[PDB]
Amino acid sequence: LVPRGSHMAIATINPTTGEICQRFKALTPAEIDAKLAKAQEAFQAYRRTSFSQRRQWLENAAAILERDTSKFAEIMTTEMGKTHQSAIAEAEKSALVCRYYAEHGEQFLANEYTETQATESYVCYQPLGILLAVMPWNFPFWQVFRFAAPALMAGNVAVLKHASNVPQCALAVEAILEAAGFPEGVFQTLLIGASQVEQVIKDPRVKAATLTGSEPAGASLASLAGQEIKPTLLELGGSDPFVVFPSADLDEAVEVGTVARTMNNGQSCIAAKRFILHEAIAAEFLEKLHLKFASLKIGDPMAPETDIGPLATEGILQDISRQVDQAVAAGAKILLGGRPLDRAGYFYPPTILTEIPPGAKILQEELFAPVAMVFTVKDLDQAIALANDIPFGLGASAWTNDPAEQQRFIQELDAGAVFINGMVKADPRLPFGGTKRSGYGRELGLAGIRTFVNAKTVWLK
Amino acid sequence: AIATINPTTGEICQRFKALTPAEIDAKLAKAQEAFQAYRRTSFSQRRQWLENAAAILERDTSKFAEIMTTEMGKTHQSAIAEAEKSALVCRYYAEHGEQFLANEYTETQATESYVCYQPLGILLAVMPWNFPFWQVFRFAAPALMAGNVAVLKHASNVPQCALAVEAILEAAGFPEGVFQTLLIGASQVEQVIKDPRVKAATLTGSEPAGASLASLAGQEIKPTLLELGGSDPFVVFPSADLDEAVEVGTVARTMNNGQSCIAAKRFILHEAIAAEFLEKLHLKFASLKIGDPMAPETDIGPLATEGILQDISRQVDQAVAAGAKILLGGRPLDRAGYFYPPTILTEIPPGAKILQEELFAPVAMVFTVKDLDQAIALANDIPFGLGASAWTNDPAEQQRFIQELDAGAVFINGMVKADPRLPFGGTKRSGYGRELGLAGIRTFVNAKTVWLK
């Protein structure tokens, strides 16, 4: 036996126990070439299917997700550490988005007509061809279905590169779609490393790409896609603010803030990361939040009662460890947590940072872990100024029952989404995506299915 | 680098100093400041200022037309038409822009859930020389109606058009700094795209510039829109009104002296009409008037630069040495300016480079095909896909063409034109995204989801 780079890049490593459970071989270039030939060929046939066949197959996928939610949930929890209960919910949402596009997708892609001197003039909507989807470990089913439901309803085929630490999830999605009846080659999972994504985008059969994840990989992909004249959609990190003002129901703010910071063990792009508290309401909020964080159960994510599993990988653990030690050293005050736990697996406790000095690195950084930054402010202008004083701009949440402050937050928060008296969620009925360094384009709603079609203008004399 | 060189006489009519990196920066500083205020203006203010710009265009079409003709060589009549269209697109977004940006509500368990449309901020536009007014207003009208500010990097050979556009917009009443023109070289675009104040960019042009712009935009996590070249098929099948097809195909190959991204460049002829059509096409091209583009009788003026003439000379020399046949033209004329004649090439060998190239000159490639399958196969046998035109009165053939041609646009019994009322853009190596129609003004905005408990 000999460890080879090929066999060592992709694995299931259970973050609860640290143990390597199973390893996989990455595809060769040749093998990749052949998957793409296969996709190109399935595309010629798949684009001729009817919305009926596609709706039928998508419905079938939804039913398989619902039947086996616990099985799929366990795969998620085993590979990347989320609570089993939240992983069951992610399977149910994955089914939901499949149903959303089965129901709306034909109508979303109908001809739109415009009166001109032409006998007929309209835009119609046609599949691009092979699409590449580069997806993250943190919502390993949901992110894949919210991309794949609309892309397949539109008539495209797709090749998925998943995060190298959720290969079982990735294989599970390929298998789900095959079992639902989508023809072989329509959706294929590529067991490949991040360096191999270059070969896929530069392949002439690949028309467009989408990436959800972080800046390094997103910059890489969109750069290369650009150089090849291929369109991308990017959803990257956030540092969403969670802004609390005097007229807010603080108890509910506290409950929802805690959930929004800690769900998925803090590893969400739309987590409440930076709590921005009005000075009147602040003492009371900070303390109530401290106490809730302190009540969270940290433990085995397979256990129903667990609120906080381990972080997903070792790397992820060192990131947040360094980011935090660094801030403490620059003078930041730990109200709670702030140290990895003395135990098996990649555990990091719920943590709260206060009195962060101006100039600290961490003000501009994404904390992908259950670690809240807290700030006090005098007025609405300071709150906007601080909320927007980041490179990112995905989501934002503000708590107030003053209609004027509500419209101000709605207008002036530089984010792709703004929730008022609620935590930012993604809901298939509505578009969703970033601004600034959080990315561009929109998934879900109408936009989700228009994103990768040729909007072909037609003019018949 | 940055100069007016009249392509009719080959001579330098005036020079311009490019900005320094410090001068660029200060323009960006000033765009940011103007954005903070411009974004608070009402649609009614913007509609008035847009309407003023249309009136300034319609009023001086002639004068602006001369600047275009003098700088880049199109016929004065067609410059006049470009100025009128530039005005049209302005009135279009002034009429529809507010409604196009209205909140769209969607019922949920929110009290209020909806999407609104907010300006992104500073936009960089990188425009080409071949439609130097139209390509800028097409981009600017929607962008300004949405509340963005813009900086424009125009082509180095049309600096006067570039300054006139800026001046038109200040004269119409858009506040200083809402639209600024930047006299800068291609290598300086990087500075601009990399500046954190610049939010998104757009480029109409060629692939080398588009690839570079979109590559750097990607690295910076910034969206772009690209409209690049094409090698549009013009496909003629046996039920076509042949005479119309010839008159219109000639226009489509020949307008703007063949320097159009949506010119008909590859004529694809069914064998049952090939001979008739080809002879007629041959006769039409042979008698077009080549000349001073200021003179109204002129059909064909010169190409816009020495390089453009060299490129097409090279490309045709190269194809002829490979075995292609010249039915007509195929050499630069011997007279002052950058004149290349209406030219037709036939019997091009398989594997010849030119089959894959964009011919930015009035040079037609002609092909004979046996059937619909084969016509579509060739229509699409290129790296581009902007437009496609097909001529036929069998409604089944019409639908096959509409469905299977790989283009951003398909016209049946007509030439491809960009109409402000409908979207327009490319696929494949022609680009992505859409200008005009509703898409035009949605491209450079934050589609913000709003959720109220």
Residue boundaries of the structural domains of chain A = 1-237+428-461, 238-427
Query: How far is Cα A416 from Cα A414, in angstroms, rounded to an integer?
Result: 7
CA neighbor of B77 nearest in space, from B337, B343, B285, B255: B255
B452: chain A residues, CB-CB within 8 Å? 406, 419-422
Phi, psi (5° rounding) for residue A364? -110, 10
- To the nearest whole Å, the CA of B389 is away from the closest chain A CA by 9
Of all helices (H) and strands (E), which one includes residue B23? helix B21-38
Inter-helix orientation angle A69-80/A167-180, to 10°? 160
Which of B423, B439, B449 is closest, CB to CB, to A430?
B449
Which of B106, B199, B439 is closest, CB to CB, to A455?
B439
- The reply to whether A1-237+428-461 and A238-427 are identical in fold is no
Rg from Cα positions in chain B: 23
CB distance B250 to B263 below 8 Å: no
Rg from Cα positions in chain A: 23
Query: How far is Cα B367 from Cα B382, in angstroms, rounded to an integer?
Result: 14
- Give yes or no for A460 touching B (CB within 8 A): yes
| CA dihedral sign of residues A179, A181, A182, A183 | positive
Residues 6+ apart with CB under 8 A from A212: A134, A135, A136, A143, A147, A234, A235, A236, A269
Number of CB atoms found within 10 A of residue A79's CB: 27
Give the resolution to one decimal, in Å.
2.5
Query: How far is Cα A87 from Cα A137, in angstroms, rounded to an integer?
Result: 12
SS3 assignment, position B367: strand
SS3 assignment, position B152: strand
Length of chain B: 453
> CA separation (Å) from A254 to A243, A296, A297?
11, 13, 17
Burial of B401 (0-12, 13-18, 19+ CB in 10 A): buried
Query: How far is Cα B270 from Cα A157, in angstroms, rounded to an integer?
Result: 33
Query: How far is Cα A238 from Cα A260, in angstroms, rounded to an integer?
Result: 13
CB distance A341 to A349 below 8 Å: yes
Amino acid at A166: V
Concatenate the DSSP letters of all residues of B390-412 into one string. EE---HHHHHHHHHHS-SSEEEE
Chain B from 110 to 149: CB within 8 A of any A CB: 110, 113, 115-116, 118, 120
Q: B203: nearest CA in chain A?
A: A229
Inter-helix orientation angle A142-153/A167-180, to 10°? 30
How big is the CA angle at B380 (ends B376 and B386), to the nearest 5 degrees?
120
Query: How far is Cα B273 from Cα B261, in angstroms, rounded to an integer?
Result: 27
| CA B278 centroid distance within chain | 28
Amino acid at A281: I
**Exactly one of A79, A90, A174, A235 is catalytic; which is it?**
A235
SS3 assignment, position B115: strand
Is B449–A417 a contact, with Cβ atoms under 8 angstroms apart? yes
**Residue with token string 């403490």:** A328
Structure tokens at B75: 């016929």
With helix as H, strand as E and coil as C, how does chain A read? CCCCHHHHCEEEECCCCCCEEEEECCCCHHHHHHHHHHHHHHHHHHCCCCHHHHHHHHHHHHHHHHHCHHHHHHHHHHHHCCCHHHHHHHHHHHHHHHHHHHHHHHHHCCCEECCCCCCEEEEEEEECCEEEEECCCCCCCHHHHHHHHHHHHCCCEEEEECCCCCHHHHHHHHHHHHHHCCCCCCEEECCCCCCCHHHHHHCCCEEEEEEECCHHHHHHHHHHHHHCCCCEEEECCCCCEEEECCCCCHHHHHHHHHHHHHHHHHCCCCCCCEEEEEHHHHHHHHHHHHHHHHHCCECCCCCCCCCECCCCCHHHHHHHHHHHHHHHHCCCEEEECCCCCCCCCCCCCCEEEECCCCCCHHHHCCCCCCEEEEEEECCHHHHHHHHHCCCCCCEEEEECCCHHHHHHHHHHCCCCEEEECCCCCCCCCCCECCCHHHEECCECHHHHHHCCEEEEEEEEC
Is A418–B447 a contact, with Cβ atoms under 8 angstroms apart? no
| DSSP secondary structure code for residue B83 in this structure | H
CB distance A280 to A434 below 8 Å: no
CB distance B301 to B73 below 8 Å: yes
| DSSP secondary structure code for residue B146 in this structure | T
Experimental method: X-ray
Query: How far is Cα A446 from Cα B104, in angstroms, rounded to an integer?
Result: 11
A44: chain B residues, CB-CB within 8 Å? none
Structure tokens at A62: 């939804």
CA neighbor of B288 nearest in space, from B88, B75, B103: B75
CA neighbor of A288 nearest in space, from A336, A331, A339, A355: A336
Query: How far is Cα B202 from Cα B223, in angstroms, rounded to an integer?
Result: 9
**Residue with token string 């954005």:** B35
Structure tokens at A435: 């601004």
Number of CB atoms found within 10 A of residue A404's CB: 9
User: Which of A227, A229, A442 would you mutate first to test chain B, the one with the most B CBs within 10 A?
Assistant: A229
| CA dihedral sign of residues B281, B287, B292, B295 | negative
Structure tokens at A359: 């100039």
Amino acid at A207: K
Bridge partners (DSSP) of residue A417 are A395, B449
Bridge partners (DSSP) of residue B94 are none
Concatenate the DSSP letters of all residues of B210-265 into one string. HHHHHHHHHHTT--EEEE-----EEEE-TTS-HHHHHHHHHHHHHGGGG--TTS--
Q: What is the largest CA-CA distance in chain A?
A: 75
Q: How far apart are the first and last CA of chain A?
A: 70
Breaks in chain B (C to N > 2.5 A) come right after: none
Structure tokens at B266: 């590859």
Chain A from 426 to 445: CB within 8 A of any B CB: 427, 429-433, 435-437, 439-442, 445
Residues 6+ apart with CB under 8 A from B22: none
The answer to whether residue B227 is catalytic is yes
The answer to whether residue A215 is catalytic is no
> CA separation (Å) from B289 to B69, B79, B257?
17, 17, 12
CB distance B248 to B257 below 8 Å: no
Structure tokens at A260: 């929004």
Phi, psi (5° rounding) for residue A429? -70, -15
CB distance A156 to A131 below 8 Å: yes
Query: How far is Cα A109 from Cα A117, in angstroms, rounded to an integer?
Result: 24
SS3 assignment, position B30: helix
Is A431–B453 a contact, with Cβ atoms under 8 angstroms apart? no
| The domain made up of A1-237+428-461 is a member of CATH 3.40.50.300 | no
> CA separation (Å) from B77 to A287, B104, B301, B349?
75, 43, 11, 38
Amino acid at A349: P
User: Which of A457, A460, A461 would you mutate first to test chain B, the one with the most B CBs within 10 A?
Assistant: A457
- Give yes or no for B411 touching A (CB within 8 A): yes
CB distance A240 to A395 below 8 Å: yes
Number of CB atoms found within 10 A of residue A366's CB: 24
| CA dihedral sign of residues A177, A179, A182, A187 | positive
Amino acid at B78: S
CB distance B299 to B254 below 8 Å: yes
> CA separation (Å) from A182 to A35, A56, A158, A178?
16, 10, 12, 5
Query: How far is Cα B267 from Cα B253, in angstroms, rounded to an integer?
Result: 9
CA neighbor of B178 nearest in space, from B72, B30, B311: B30
Query: How far is Cα A458 from Cα A453, in angstroms, rounded to an integer?
Result: 15
Inter-helix orientation angle B207-219/A215-227, to 10°? 180
Number of CB atoms found within 10 A of residue B167's CB: 12
Structure tokens at A286: 């900070």
Residues 6+ apart with CB under 8 A from B157: B3, B4, B5, B71, B72, B129, B304, B305
CA neighbor of B122 nearest in space, from B16, B4, B32, B2: B32
Chain A from 213 to 242: CB within 8 A of any B CB: 215, 218-219, 221-232, 234, 236
Is B221–A219 a contact, with Cβ atoms under 8 angstroms apart? yes
List, in sequence order, the alpha helices (H) in B39-183: 43-59, 61-72, 76-101, 134-145, 159-172
> CA separation (Å) from B323 to B235, B332, B340, B374?
23, 20, 21, 22
CB distance B419 to A386 below 8 Å: no
| DSSP secondary structure code for residue B149 in this structure | E
Query: How far is Cα A142 from Cα A93, in angstroms, rounded to an integer?
Result: 7
Is A219–B217 a contact, with Cβ atoms under 8 angstroms apart? no
Structure tokens at B412: 């049946």
Residues 6+ apart with CB under 8 A from B180: B27, B30, B31, B149, B150, B151, B152, B166
A409: chain B residues, CB-CB within 8 Å? none
Q: A392: nearest CA in chain B?
A: B221
Concatenate the DSSP letters of all residues of B293-353 into one string. TTSTT-SB---S-HHHHHHHHHHHHHHHHTT-EEEE--S--SSSS-----EEEE-PPTT-G
Query: How far is Cα B184 from Cα B224, in angstroms, rounded to an integer?
Result: 20
Q: A215: nearest CA in chain B?
A: B221
A207: chain B residues, CB-CB within 8 Å? 428
SS3 assignment, position B284: helix
Structure tokens at B232: 């549009």
Amino acid at B175: P
Q: What is the CATH number of domain B1-229+420-453?
A: 3.40.605.10
Bridge partners (DSSP) of residue A153 are none
SS3 assignment, position B431: strand
Which of B221, B403, B428 is closest, CB to CB, to A215?
B221
Residues 6+ apart with CB under 8 A from A310: A15, A16, A81, A265, A301, A317, A345, A346, A347, A348
CA neighbor of A443 nearest in space, from A84, A133, A65, A16: A133
| The domain made up of A238-427 is a member of CATH 3.40.309.10 | yes
Structure tokens at B93: 């977004």
Q: Which fold would CATH assign to domain B230-419?
A: Aldehyde Dehydrogenase; Chain A, domain 2 (3.40.309)
Query: How far is Cα A125 from Cα A263, in angstroms, rounded to an integer?
Result: 38
Query: How far is Cα A195 from Cα A343, in angstroms, rounded to an integer?
Result: 33
Query: How far is Cα A358 from Cα B420, in angstroms, rounded to an integer?
Result: 50
- To the nearest whole Å, the CA of A220 is away from the closest chain B CA by 6
Q: In this structure, are strands B445-452 and A417-420 parallel, antiparallel, or unpaired?
A: parallel
Query: How far is Cα A287 from Cα A273, in angstroms, rounded to an integer?
Result: 17
